[PDB]
Symmetry: C2
Subunit: 290 residues, 2 copies
């Protein structure tokens, strides 16, 4: 992997952040915020790589720190959403009170260099967002460069180009952050992964021969590819559960789930959980209360 992306990205985030206030460009500020999200993503990726190749799986994190990638992805998406909210609010203000670019040359140089940085990053919608933001910065600087606006003269149409394009790229960036927010939240909400079709899976689980009932089916995803399926199963007392275990495990394997914990409970009250918490008062803090 490449780690020089982190130092370059943080230095360039600082550069765009300084030049955006120095040049009075929201598009440069929006691109600086987008590269801030990019460097947060790089830090999250390095954290995931460090968690891998050196697992801990101790007494504090039972599953491990694999969920760090998803938590960091959701946090980065929410961070970028708040930054885009601030950028959109500022752009709406400048759509009412327009402002000039103080140093069009500085903004042009920083935007061109940011476009080059994003190009080399892609070389080594979500991905094209940074490139389009740098293109927007370059266009805004060029308009103030090819057709200069005198300081004494009031704001012409040129002052509205930056807020409009910045609003457009706020929309573009949000159109990528929102699906990411939805996916990472769905993973973190302990929801069934999109690949797993639960209806057919429960149909097959019920169709498994020699099994009385199936309850407390809890299928959730730790990370991409790690699907955990907790499951309680009621079986006739006289018969065993070795064949049932094999069939349920192969069904889950064919459904893409390899982490299957089956609790077998001996057998209209014969459908409830035979092994809840040892007290009747535990029914409050029991998922799927009986």
């Amino acid at each position: 992997r490449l780690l020089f992306m982190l130092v370059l990205t943080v230095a360039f985030f600082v550069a765009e952040l300084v030049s955006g206030y120095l040049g009075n460009s929201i598009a440069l500020l929006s691109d600086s915020f987008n590269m801030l999200s990019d460097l947060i993503s790089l830090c999250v990726g390095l954290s995931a790589g460090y968690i891998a190749r050196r697992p801990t799986r101790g007494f504090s994190a039972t599953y491990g720190y694999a969920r760090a990638e998803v938590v960091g992805a959701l946090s980065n998406a929410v961070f970028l959403t708040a930054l885009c909210f601030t950028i959109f609010v500022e752009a709406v203000l400048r759509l009412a009170r327009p402002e000039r670019i103080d140093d069009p040359e500085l903004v042009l140089i920083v935007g061109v260099l940011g476009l080059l940085v994003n190009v080399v990053g892609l070389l080594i919608l979500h991905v094209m967002g940074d490139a389009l933001g740098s293109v927007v910065v370059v266009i805004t600087a060029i308009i103030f460069y090819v057709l200069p606006l005198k300081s004494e003269d009031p704001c012409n149409w040129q002052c509205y180009i930056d807020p409009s394009l910045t609003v457009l790229m706020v929309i573009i960036i949000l159109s990528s952050a929102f699906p990411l927010i939805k996916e990472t939240a769905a993973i973190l909400l302990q929801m069934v992964p999109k690949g797993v079709n639960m209806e057919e899976l429960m149909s097959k689980l019920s169709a498994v021969p020699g099994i009385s009932s199936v309850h407390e089916v809890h299928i959730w995803e730790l990370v991409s590819g790690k699907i955990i399926a907790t499951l309680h199963i009621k079986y006739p007392k006289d018969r065993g559960y070795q064949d049932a275990s094999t069939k349920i495990r192969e069904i889950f394997h064919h459904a893409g789930i390899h982490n299957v914990t089956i609790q077998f409970e001996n057998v209209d009250l014969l459908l409830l959980c035979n092994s809840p918490c040892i007290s009747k008062g535990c029914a409050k803090q029991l998922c799927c209360p009986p």
Copy 2:
């Protein structure tokens, strides 16, 4: 419960966002962002209240949407952290280039009314942060009121009071968001809840009579009070596991865990999981792989 806090809070968020931008006050802007986080928290609380007393727990969310409170808490904390990052960056910018307050009267009125809004919200460290943010806005407005500053006159010490206090309250707000970020991330990372002392719990689990081995102990917290403990247990084949099940469940009950799924596996190599995925290639996906 009362939901008029939502409409009042959103209206006042709009009011402070407009007034701080019209009055050029970061402290008013910081308080508007803090009340935006407050209304996000109110929306999260309403979502949690709707999830309760009306559960769904269907084929999409096995554990339900109870984790929505934690996901919304982390999202709100990250949103507020990004807003505070923007506020701190702006304040540092004004710490270099000071600015006047355009309409001190408007900022004074909005800050006083925001303090009243916080007071009435109390009537019906985050609280100290919000109250002190309103007090900071009020103080900044008063300073520009008792000693009015003419536009012709350059910025005196008065122009640096707003950025300094705003930086201070960015620190204060972050000192509350960061513990919340840590706690909600720990919950969402599938980490052992703080109350559960895993060392003693595994000691007792091993000390349980009639049990050969214990592996795949996965203790995580869905929400406050809902602790889920998946667990694989190896037991001697000749002996049963009814007494072992009772003892393990009562141990988990005394440790504060009521959702316990125990998989009992019949018995050097007699310590590995007897029921991995049906294929040897599944070991790359085995969470906690042997």
